[PDB]
Design an enzyme around this catalytic site. Sequence first.
Site, PDB file in Angstrom:
ATOM      1  N   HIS A  35       0.812  -1.220   0.000  1.00 52.34           N
ATOM      2  CA  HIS A  35       0.000   0.000   0.000  1.00 52.34           C
ATOM      3  C   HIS A  35       0.843   1.266   0.000  1.00 52.34           C
ATOM      4  CE1 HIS A  35       0.781   0.959   4.215  1.00 52.34           C
ATOM      5  NE2 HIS A  35       0.454  -0.274   4.555  1.00 52.34           N
ATOM      6  N   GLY A 137       2.898   3.814  14.001  1.00 48.59           N
ATOM      7  CA  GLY A 137       3.707   4.523  13.033  1.00 48.59           C
ATOM      8  C   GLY A 137       4.896   3.756  12.513  1.00 48.59           C
ATOM      9  N   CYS A 139       4.904   1.222   9.930  1.00 47.78           N
ATOM     10  CA  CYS A 139       4.591   0.430   8.753  1.00 47.78           C
ATOM     11  C   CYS A 139       5.816  -0.130   8.080  1.00 47.78           C
ATOM     12  CB  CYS A 139       3.700   1.178   7.756  1.00 47.78           C
ATOM     13  SG  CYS A 139       1.994   1.346   8.280  1.00 47.78           S
TER      14      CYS A 139
END
Length: 182
Positions: A35, A137, A139
């Site tokens: 993503h 936070g 990812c």
Amino acid sequence: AFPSGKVEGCMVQVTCGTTTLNGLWLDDVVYCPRHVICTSEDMLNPNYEDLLIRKSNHNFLVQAGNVQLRVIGHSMQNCVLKLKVDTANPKTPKYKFVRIQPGQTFSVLACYNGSPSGVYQCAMRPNFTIKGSFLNGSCGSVGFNIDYDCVSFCYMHHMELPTGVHAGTDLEGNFYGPFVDR
């Protein structure tokens, strides 16, 4: 709980447009959540196959500290993006990919924008989520176990759920549990 030195030397920063997250650099491949090629409006109903074709190699900015890696190829394997770079990581440890189950412990190297911030022992709950602010936070941070000299990567963080828990995949791109990256 596991020492993180072998993993720290593989963490990189991956940026596509305005999105920046962590990637894992092994041999001449960088693994990161797919993503990253999504914008704000894309993340509601993304066509990952159309987005892959829309992006060129120079849309990807990969940095290992001050060294900049040039992306020369990009493919998708389930929910992980695999970026081929023009250099092999000289600090690539002995490794393998494994899939684990909830209740089994592993160490997570929480990073922000490619920089290691902490290492923590945790386990997935029976619903395949992890509860912990340590990962907010982060990812693209990976989880792993050390089997003597070999690093077994078993987890990659993908998203924070509304309920403050976290969902992720294995290093083959298959989500743990019924989650989807949309």
